[PDB]
Amino acid sequence: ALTQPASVSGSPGQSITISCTGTSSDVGGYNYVSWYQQHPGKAPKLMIYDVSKRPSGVSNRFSGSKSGNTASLTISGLQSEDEADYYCNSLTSISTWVFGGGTKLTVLGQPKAAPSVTLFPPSSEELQANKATLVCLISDFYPGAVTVAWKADSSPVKAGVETTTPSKQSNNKYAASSYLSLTPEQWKSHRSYSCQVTHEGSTVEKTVAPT
Amino acid sequence: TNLCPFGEVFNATRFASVYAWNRKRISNCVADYSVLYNSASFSTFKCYGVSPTKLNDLCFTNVYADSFVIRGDEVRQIAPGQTGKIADYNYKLPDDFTGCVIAWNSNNLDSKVGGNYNYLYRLFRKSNLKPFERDISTEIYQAGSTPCNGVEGFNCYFPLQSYGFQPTNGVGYQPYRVVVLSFELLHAPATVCG
Amino acid sequence: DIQMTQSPSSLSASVGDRVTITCQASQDITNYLNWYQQKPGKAPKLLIYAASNLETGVPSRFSGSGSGTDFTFTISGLQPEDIATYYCQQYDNLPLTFGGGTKVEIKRTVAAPSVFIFPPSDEQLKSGTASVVCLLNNFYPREAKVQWKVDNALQSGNSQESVTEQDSKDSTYSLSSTLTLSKADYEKHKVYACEVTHQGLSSPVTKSFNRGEC
Amino acid sequence: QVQLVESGGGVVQPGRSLRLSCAASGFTFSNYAMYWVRQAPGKGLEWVAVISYDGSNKYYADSVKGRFTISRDNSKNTLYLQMNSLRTEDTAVYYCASGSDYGDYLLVYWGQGTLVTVSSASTKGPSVFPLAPTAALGCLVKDYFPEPVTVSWNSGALTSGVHTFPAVLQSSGLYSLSSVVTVPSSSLGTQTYICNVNHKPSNTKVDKKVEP
Amino acid sequence: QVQLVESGGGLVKPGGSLRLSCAASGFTFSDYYMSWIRQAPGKGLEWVSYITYSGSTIYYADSVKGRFTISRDNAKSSLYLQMNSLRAEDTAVYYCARDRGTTMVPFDYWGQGTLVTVSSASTKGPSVFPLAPTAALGCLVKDYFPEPVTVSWNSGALTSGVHTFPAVLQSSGLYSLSSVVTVPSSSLGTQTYICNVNHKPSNTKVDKKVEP
Ligand SMILES: *[C@@H]1O[C@H](CO)[C@@H](O[C@@H]2O[C@H](CO)[C@@H](O[C@@H]3O[C@H](CO[C@H]4O[C@H](CO)[C@@H](O)[C@H](O)[C@@H]4O)[C@@H](O)[C@H](O)[C@@H]3O)[C@H](O)[C@H]2NC(C)=O)[C@H](O)[C@H]1NC(C)=O
């Protein structure tokens, strides 16, 4: 695989550069550049091929280049719609094929959003089947930063946690779920279980008690 | 008072191999060669007898158009008094050549992964090729003593072989299209001008 | 399947001599034969193709002819570097085959055999065996006799001769007669001598030594 | 018009085989190569294989080499895949590549793509339970298989405050999804909330009445 | 300039298999026939195989049929050969021969060749012993296998007055050669010398001084 930045961000109207680095045998030996843009869940679209060449239809604002064993793509005048992934590609004269990697771009227009966290005691029907999965539901946070850390009475707990990668929700924020796997003897013997989340350093406390 | 259909010639979507090189007689135009000359999209542009700028503002009576696919390393063979595979057995410009030759990279159009088995070039022959001599014959030449009987075998297979054209090749090992111009003068009035 | 016959199987002559090799076919082959040259160790090289044509870059001193079934190849004047085996092969029918082989030496008047003797290396003595060698360098002709003598006792049956190919400048021969033994009996014996009885010699000369002295 | 339509596929078991295809129209199918690109869920892309323009030459990714076969047909303009010796890692959505003109090995037209998963998990119907404590409610669609199950509150009546969370695959093999409603405590008891769960691979209707 | 470099080789068990190659240069490799000729140690030549330009027609020798195969590759400009069910008597130096080239001339510059053996004892390396006394010098290599072994004096610093004897077979089953060098004793104690052994089947490069 090649080298790509795992993330990148900027302000609307700025100009950003993204790195696509490989070895010398493939990208450094041929003018065989190829860049792409892929909206979430849609089909990719060709943007740049072999130096800076653009398929008929894409605007001239896109621009890319390559140096040594490094390929570079430069955007001018960031916009909200251009906030999407980007992929690079080139030839593989060792009789194979290879792609660049992953690079998520996020043009930040709003500063930050605080999460909306919800906690529920396990359903009465779940406990009857010797099951107690404490579930804490999180929503409305931005950017994509949320980790789960369940809080017992007086000791931290992370046993059998289902940690999630933040997914952008509809209102230009993110949202997530949780599932805590402790034994029923852990669920009832505690005084009050608390749900503690971390989003961009922000924490909102929600506690549950056995009723 | 119409232009020469250079669009369908150069920008054609299909080309014939060199031994079966195609020909299109063209005449009776108003000609602007500068659109190609200054296009600067051609990796090579030479010819002999008249300079491009001086020929653009000049009248001529008859011109032909021919085209095929060769290899980059052998592009130099398209010149008077050259030698090699193509010069000997596939195409040989006369010494007093008065046409024009153009060639550009077409690795983006004609090459194909795995090797393009379409275009061909003649390999052996009993003699040299005359000027503009086309030889479509796939007749099995017999340099032995036993009868040939058409089948391909121990003596002198087809004088026809296909390039590889893998895209992963070097510069000279990739196909460069070519269009050979021909400029001649006769007693007929000049039908093409600018 | 068609058999080919080279003739003769051996040949010797001095410088400036003219020699001729002959090739006779089994069935009719008009003008389809080649002539090769294989210097020892190296790879062969075409000399004359179609039994009539001169390869470019080969000295014009080679030439042959023949047609139909009987074919001949001639050499105008030998040279101290034209010493190599020669080969011919059919050129028409599906199962190609080559000749049989023919060597071409160079004949000289005579050369006196220079003699040497070499003691075994001490590290080989540490290994536990004795491989003594008697050198005869830069002599002629190739035939010669070498005889060992240890403590006035003739030794034969455990010898081993290795002869080099003839030279290209002076066209001489050289033999390295090696008498390999164990160090035990080699220490049991003290005096060693290899004796040569060559034609060019007038008397049997013998280089010797004494173990432990040198 | 220049378009591409993939054949289709679905869930399969490991070690088995499966065939995929791709429909073409609007261009000379007989004059271009074909490729196939796969993308893991929420990750990068990966080349799979190539096929020459005339069914002559073949290539394979070092991971798939020995498990796949490609085949085309200039008559029906129909390209064929055959994934053999199915592995669960190969689970991805596979894209039918162009081989477009003005180009070479590179890829342009990029038909939509068929999602195909490989997992020997127990297909279990959705069992729903309430999520009861700006107070919120919810329904618990836990331990189901496969993905996905669609939810709807009051059959298209509640929309303000609906989010989809990452219900990442539990290593046991069954997912667990839910639905949320963020509503002030003043209107919790007035109106009712019903979670219309529809597991369309099983076509079941399961409901529950959550109340704080 | 026109050359023909051959691939590797070495020991092969009886009935085993091996792949040979023949890289090319200086000529359009797609315009010439190919053929393979073998020569046992100190015997006559022998035709084995013959392949046309496109792998369309194939010929073998009646003694090798059913066991040999040829191939071509117009891209890599490199001829191949794979031999299976090896007989012991196949041990020879298989060359790399073109045929009936573009002009007309047959069997042109066909080149060096690679040894191929059929035996199974070991792949051990040599040991050296010096020899010291108008005298001469030399170093002795002994009990090595398999052939060949090239030797240079002072990394080929000396070119005249040097001799190498062609090795023979020892009764144990190994080879052993010898090399001597002569010089006037004027510079006996002044200059020093080392012979450079190179046993490619084991790469055991050893050197050794020679002084009384
Ligand atoms: C063979 O096909 C070619 C492709 O159609 C023909 O080339 C077209 O010929 C026209 C004749 O004038 C050229 O014309 C001008 O090009 C400029 C530059 O366009 C570029 O700049 C714009 C921004 O202004 C950018 O968006 C484009 O992507 C280009 O980078 C235009 O501004 C003019 O309005 C005018 O169109 C074309 O450039 C040329 N096409 C190409 C791809 O170069 C060619 O003439 C044909 N040959 C024959 C003999 O018919």
Residue numbers in the entry:
A (entry chain A): 3 to 213
B (entry chain E): 333 to 526
C (entry chain D): 1 to 214
D (entry chain C), E (entry chain B): 1 to 133, 142 to 220
Sentences copied from the publication:
In this work, we describe parallel high-throughput efforts using both mice and humans to generate antibodies against the spike protein of severe acute respiratory syndrome coronavirus 2 (SARS-CoV-2). The prospective goal of these parallel efforts was to generate a large and diverse collection so as to allow for the selection of pairs of highly potent individual antibodies that could simultaneously bind the critical receptor binding domain (RBD) of the spike protein, thereby providing ideal partners for a therapeutic antibody cocktail that would have the potential to decrease the likelihood of virus escape mutants that might arise in response to selective pressure from single-antibody treatments. All of these neutralizing mAbs bound to the RBD of SARS-CoV-2 spike and blocked its ability to interact with ACE2 with double-digit picomolar median inhibitory concentrations (IC50s), which supports ACE2 blockade as the primary mechanism for neutralization. By combining the efforts from two parallel and high-throughput approaches for generating antibodies to the RBD of the SARS-CoV-2 spike protein, we generated a sufficiently large collection of potent and diverse antibodies that we could meet our prospective goal of identifying highly potent individual antibodies that could be combined into a therapeutic antibody cocktail.
Comparing the cross-competition binding assays with the HDX-MS results provides structural insights into the mechanism by which noncompeting pairs of antibodies can simultaneously bind the RBD and can thus be ideal partners for a therapeutic antibody cocktail. REGN10987 and REGN10933 represent such a pair of antibodies: REGN10933 targets the spike-like loop region on one edge of the ACE2 interface. Within that region, the residues that show the most notable HDX protection by REGN10933 face upward, which suggests that the Fab region of REGN10933 binds the RBD from the top direction, where REGN10933 will have collisions with ACE2. To avoid competition with REGN10933, REGN10987 can only bind to the HDX-defined protected regions from the front or the lower left side (in the front view of REGN10987 in Fig. 3). A three-dimensional (3D) reconstructed map of the complex with nominal resolution of 3.9 Å shows that the two Fab fragments bind at different epitopes on the RBD, which confirms that they are noncompeting antibodies. REGN10933 binds at the top of the RBD, extensively overlapping the binding site for ACE2. On the other hand, the epitope for REGN10987 is located on the side of the RBD, away from the REGN10933 epitope, and has little to no overlap with the ACE2 binding site. Inclusion of such antibodies into an antibody cocktail may deliver optimal antiviral potency while minimizing the odds of virus escape (7)—two critical, desired features of an antibody-based therapeutic for treatment and prevention of COVID-19.
